[PDB]
Amino acid sequence: VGIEAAIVLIAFVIVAAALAFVALNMGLFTTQKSKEVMQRGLEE
Amino acid sequence: VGIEAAIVLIAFVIVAAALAFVALNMGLFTTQKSKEVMQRGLEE
Numbered sequence: 104v105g106i107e108a109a110i111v112l113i114a115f116v117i118v119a120a121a122l123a124f125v126a127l128n129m130g131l132f133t134t135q136k137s138k139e140v141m142q143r144g145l146e147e
Numbered sequence: 148v149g150i151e152a153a154i155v156l157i158a159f160v161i162v163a164a165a166l167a168f169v170a171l172n173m174g175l176f177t178t179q180k181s182k183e184v185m186q187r188g189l190e191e
Contacts, residue, residue, distance in 0.1 A: 141150060145157075 144150075144154060
C-alpha cells in the first residue's frame, strides 16, 4: 500500500521540479528583456 | 508606473529647453536689430 503511494509522490515531486526549472528560467529571461526594453525606451 | 512618468517628464523638459534656446537666440537678435535701426534713425 505504501510503495505505490511513494511512487506517486516521487512522480509528483519530479513534475514540480520541472515546472520550477521552467518557471525560473523563463522568469529570469523575461526580467532581463524587460530591463533591456525599458533601457531602450529611456534611450529613445 | 513611475518610469513612463519619468520619460514623459524628460521629454517635456527637453522640449522646454529647445523653446528657451530659440527664444533667447531670436530675442537677442531682435534687440540688436532694434538698436541698429534706432541708431540709423538718429543718424537720419
